[PDB]
Design a protein around this ligand. Structure first.
Ligand code: OAH
Ligand code: OAH
Ligand code: OAH
Ligand code: CYT
Ligand code: CYT
Ligand code: CYT
Lengths: 519, 519, 519
């Protein structure tokens, strides 16, 4: 239960702050079509003339899925502000899902005149793959998430997946999943669906920027008790003579003092400028791109290793594929102008992580001697070395929240490369589909496959509640900190607001790293 | 106790399946000679003219050791089948050892006519180095393990070890262990030895292959909300002009979509072909071999990092030293023909791990600009990078089970590089030796070292029971999976069977990765 | 336990009659060699030039097996007499096995002079395949059973088996069993082995002959109330005219009276005479032999369906392969003279079962009419028809006792075709083998297979006790019955006795069907 003329759920949609806790609960109203005419279909790069690196094999499903894996699905711009401006970190604790006031309509089109009526007896099916038995497509930054603006109605994305492929063909080990082979709950107007999940223990997300840097971590007023080789050729003597002179760590030469740690790992990336003139005249997008080679296919590393987007005084350049880029509502599908996208800046970590477009360092390459000169080389790729420390890619008000850690034998610091929390057991995929309704069948039994169905779609609200744990700050810093603030200068439109046509717009990407914390 | 005419143990040798458990208990009958005439001997590469990389210093011991560190010591071919075809993983829990029905014979050779009689009062000594105070030689894939075929009698290997060396000489820090300086139990016909060990907590071995690949892990039906730099030179305009055009993650271009993870680490290896014609005419075996340099000595990395043995459609090539190779019973000591060995194929992991003979990827090497062109380089060696995930080298019916994690300050994902479980405290080495029996001594005291002994050997059965924990599968996959199956086509001999001469033969190497599991 | 100088079992060997029960317990002393040098060997018809019907593939084992599946292993001639002369039936209830006073000797041959000494520490292994996991070879009438005469020492047969074969090659589904892969008990002089089994419920064996026949089962003094068509052409009328005259069952014409049952099933067999002159001059042994065709191979049906060996007054002929034939102790391997074998006579069942060399009957083959004449044919093969009744092949003092009912989906009246009791779970196969004893091994470890062993054999007594259930008789018959009796007429030797050289001899085959019982 209960009934047809009885709401099966209310509009819960608030935000509650409780010291070290904050419950965000937002509800949006959705629309679900009938996909593929209730058919599972094999799909492939086959006959697309697709590049060799773009081949793929998989299946498109008749099911739709719920996806709220974006911060703006839960935090209003103002809340996000509250969060990033006063806390050193946060993480998800537990969540709550709910489907209600579901209504199934049946459209009868004819003579251009289409009519929409209720089919009070139709059902919609749901089920959460809580045992992760289906391929996981959440956490690949796809569209179809809950809209940022509560007053927006959205369309549920269609669920499709991929599997092992050799060119545009499949292989023996390829897998095909049928979602109807999963116990799922059926609903009619008066029914509703609910379910709760608990997040696994996960590190707080570092919502702060360091107020010191690895190199500058010593006492500016005092020497060290350590010495380093300072000269191998004596100064003057009106001749250049071989020697071995040592000096001891001085504040006057911090760049040469023995230290305890190393910058973060790094996989260098090409650098491009926001002013076309500076760029080389060619299309190096794929040519000079940092790609990884997985079984014959190349794939751009994007955004790849967390690295400072640019060195100080140069928010002019950016890693060719080392920064998150969101599109403004104006941006088109492909080859859209620069001012139609928003490129994130990850320079807040230049204090501990290597800059993405530069060399990580220099390495000795030979054995110097009186007869052969000491040579070196530039290291462009650097794996994990003991003593390394680093910061992970920051998250954004419109970025991903989590991603499922692949189920592999081993894995290194599994933090989703494009921002987020790495979960061994993430929130499960919620699958929904309209059950088929056979149109009038022949008056004489026919065994051939049924392919005539009442055309219909469904609609209802969905509520998602998440309890977040805050990590308050207690900086003993004396001077004011940086804080996200809307510009007070007058203008035609207000940031994160609708316009004269009712189109909600997210002007810029907001990070979370404003508050300071020493190393 | 008990007595001379009383069996001190029975032939336990079965296999029991209990849902998530499986107890394999196999017993073989052994033969132990007298090694080195009861003498400890110093040994070295000294005076062998041995290469510089082959020098070594150590001691050969009068003791023998038990070694059952190979899967076929416990699993029959059929059992192995049962295992690999229905479980997603497994691991050792606890074991049980037992020595019994020991008999000591004394051979009296003369005039070519040798006679073997029982020495009812002789003793054999045993002891398990359960405190790991002796150099560990198990887990280096040596011969001498329990035979695969239960009906085979085997000879216990002789225990020898190495220590620090400088060329063919020793050093101050070198160590010399005397096994008689360990409390050991002595046995006569009527005695027996028993002992049980419990395995440490260890990850299940991944006995499955992925049904998806890192690159192809997204939803084939939906776009992303992320954008990437698509062109840096505008298309057409009857002129090639600098630009900055962005596109957004589309299914039509998966190879360029921002992702969350990276392929596994990699240390490139040379590639050789099974058809000599394709190979270069030279002996690059050591020349172009991937070697590591540890204190003046070079050593081939073999099999090294877990990497796909070859890309799709090429089970024709193989890493020069990146795959396990077992010899057929026909194979000789050295320089034996190809068809006398069996080369394992590790292509089951090409979904997550880099191919061993190819570059891991491409890296930007400079700072492009209108005046200087964007250049890149091929990365042949790649250390651990955050966001990396990978699969470990599979194990084989005739491969190692475990290896002792070296006792070092640090260590990375310590999974035995040539397959197996890394144990901090592995099953201890079981040492056995025939106690010396002085031949008739002079009738007048002489202090010089005793060197006249009754010639004798011993024999008895040994039982090893291991309880394995299974990780059942619950794949919601719809289509049939791949499964190990003996070929049904008729032939002269049955696989894993004796021939007309009674020689047991293991036709091919069986892996464990057949079942599928999505990423 | 217990000890070396301590007997581990006594010589139980009696027979006890207890009304409706009879316990036969006999013990014989055995000798077991080392077979195949402790090697499992593949064996086949390969390269024997063997006929197409004689191909086979299998393995010969290093194990020996105990077999007491012959009545004379338990019943003395006199006991057998007691049994067959006073009981209407009998069957096995429960049994008891025991191995003891086992002694292992080690032969050292040299210079033609061979010496046999005790190896007080050697072991012999035993185990009963009580789960029927090994191919069953008992119940195929092989030699190697316990000797009839208690004072005879015997050699344990070697255990070998067959499996699926295509010509002289094997197939995928072929099976290879290793007996060392079975938990088995080990014994030294002072040890012994014991085990008891309980027979399944099985029909008593019909140890009687019918004193009536199917056709002659009515009242000789009275008519029937039924009528039958007696003539279709009127008698006389000085002309032969069509008619329909009926008569009623009269004693004067029993051969035409309606009856209630039918004779037994039948598969006709060629007939041969004991006096060569009567036989056709050719070698029809295989030519005109009744063979069955199972997958390309032909096989003689022998002895096949239970049928009377010959009609009354003709114990001169016999079914070419429809009667059991035992060889006198004089008979050779092949092509031995008639008077060197003993051919059983199964005429005791001619009262209910069809004679083996004749047609089962006659059948109408067409539709007679004034224009076409009524024709018939001889039926040579007759399957089970409702209303059929029959007697099974009798057993002999020197015949089989039981056989294992094959594990097949279905099976018809599974009474072992060559006499005996069909058991779903028969007494298990008892397997015994001498454990190998490595001769002196090299003084330097060698991984190659061990192939040097102390030559030895074992010996001991074996006791088998069986409790049989008797089915006493209560015939109200007035006249004396037939009874097995030794001839009283004087002669040179006594039946079932040793001769002047100590050779026990079984003069004739004794059945069990002497007593009478009406239908
Ligand atoms: N930023 C981060 N750094 C390290 N680990 C993180 C992380 N975010 C999430 N994790 C994961 C969550 C858990 O999966 C844990 C790893 O668990 P397991 O893979 O060994 O079974 O750390
Ligand atoms: N495949 C695998 N991956 C990671 N660890 C493994 C492994 N197999 C065994 N181990 C080891 C077993 C334990 O030694 C544990 C490491 O323990 P510790 O060296 O820090 O004291 O992980
Ligand atoms: N002379 C005989 N007639 C009929 N059955 C006999 C028999 N002798 C033995 N049996 C078997 C013994 C049991 O196996 C029983 C059949 O059992 P199941 O094969 O249906 O499981 O009848
Ligand atoms: N960071 C890690 C250390 C060891 N093993 C892993 O899988 N990951
Ligand atoms: N994987 C590892 C991380 C940190 N320390 C180690 O020894 N190993
Ligand atoms: N006699 C029989 C009747 C039915 N089924 C059988 O297997 N046997």
């Amino acid at each position: 239960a209960d009934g047809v003329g009885n709401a099966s759920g209310n509009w819960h949609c608030d935000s509650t702050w409780l010291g070290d806790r904050v419950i965000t609960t937002s509800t949006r109203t959705w629309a679900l079509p009938t996909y593929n005419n209730h058919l599972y279909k094999q799909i492939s790069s086959a006959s697309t003339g697709a590049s060799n690196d773009n081949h793929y094999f998989g299946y498109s499903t008749p099911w739709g899925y719920f996806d709220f894996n974006r911060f703006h699905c839960h935090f209003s711009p103002r809340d996000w502000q509250r969060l990033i401006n006063n806390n050193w970190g946060f993480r998800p604790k537990r969540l709550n899902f709910k489907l209600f006031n579901i209504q199934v309509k049946e459209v009868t089109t004819n003579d251009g005149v289409t009519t929409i009526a209720n089919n009070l007896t139709s059902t919609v099916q749901v089920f959460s793959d809580s045992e992760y038995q289906l391929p996981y497509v959440l956490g690949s930054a796809h569209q179809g998430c809950l809209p940022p603006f509560p007053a927006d109605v959205f369309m549920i994305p269609q669920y499709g997946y991929l599997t092992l492929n050799n060119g545009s063909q499949a292989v023996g080990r390829s897998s095909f999943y049928c979602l109807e082979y999963f116990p799922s709950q059926m609903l009619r107007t008066g029914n509703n669906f609910t379910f709760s999940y608990t997040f696994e223990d996960v590190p707080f997300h570092s919502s702060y920027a360091h107020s010191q840097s690895l190199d500058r971590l010593m006492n500016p007023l005092i020497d060290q008790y350590l010495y380093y080789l300072n000269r191998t050729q004596n100064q003057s003597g009106s001749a250049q003579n071989k020697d071995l002179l040592f000096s001891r760590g001085s504040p006057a030469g911090m760049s040469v003092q023995p230290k305890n740690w190393l910058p973060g790992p790094c996989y260098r990336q090409q650098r491009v400028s926001k002013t076309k003139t500076d760029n080389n005249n060619s299309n190096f997008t794929w040519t000079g791109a940092s790609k990884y080679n997985l079984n014959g296919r190349e794939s751009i590393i994007n955004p790849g290793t967390a690295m400072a987007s640019h060195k100080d005084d140069k928010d002019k350049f950016f890693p060719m594929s080392g920064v998150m880029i969101f599109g403004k509502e104006s941006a088109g599908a492909s080859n859209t102008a620069l001012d139609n996208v928003m490129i994130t800046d990850e320079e807040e970590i230049k204090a501990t992580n290597p800059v993405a477009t530069e060399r990580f360092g220099t390495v000795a390459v030979n054995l110097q001697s009186s007869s052969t000169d000491p040579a070196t080389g530039d290291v462009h790729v650097m794996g994990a070395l003991p003593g390394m420390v680093w910061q992970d890619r920051d998250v954004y008000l419109q970025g991903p929240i989590w991603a499922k850690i692949p189920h592999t034998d081993g894995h290194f610091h599994p933090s989703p490369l494009m921002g987020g929390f790495g979960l061994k057991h993430p929130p499960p995929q919620i699958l929904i589909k309209n059950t088929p309704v056979p149109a009038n069948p022949p008056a004489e039994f026919s065994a051939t496959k049924f392919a005539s169905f009442i055309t219909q779609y469904s609609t209802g609200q969905v509520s998602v509640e998440i309890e977040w744990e805050l990590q308050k700050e207690n900086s003993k810093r004396w001077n004011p900190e940086v804080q996200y603030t809307s510009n007070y200068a007058k203008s035609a439109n207000v940031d994160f607001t609708v316009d004269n046509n009712g189109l909600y717009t997210e002007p810029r990407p907001i990070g979370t790293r404003y508050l300071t914390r020493p190393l």
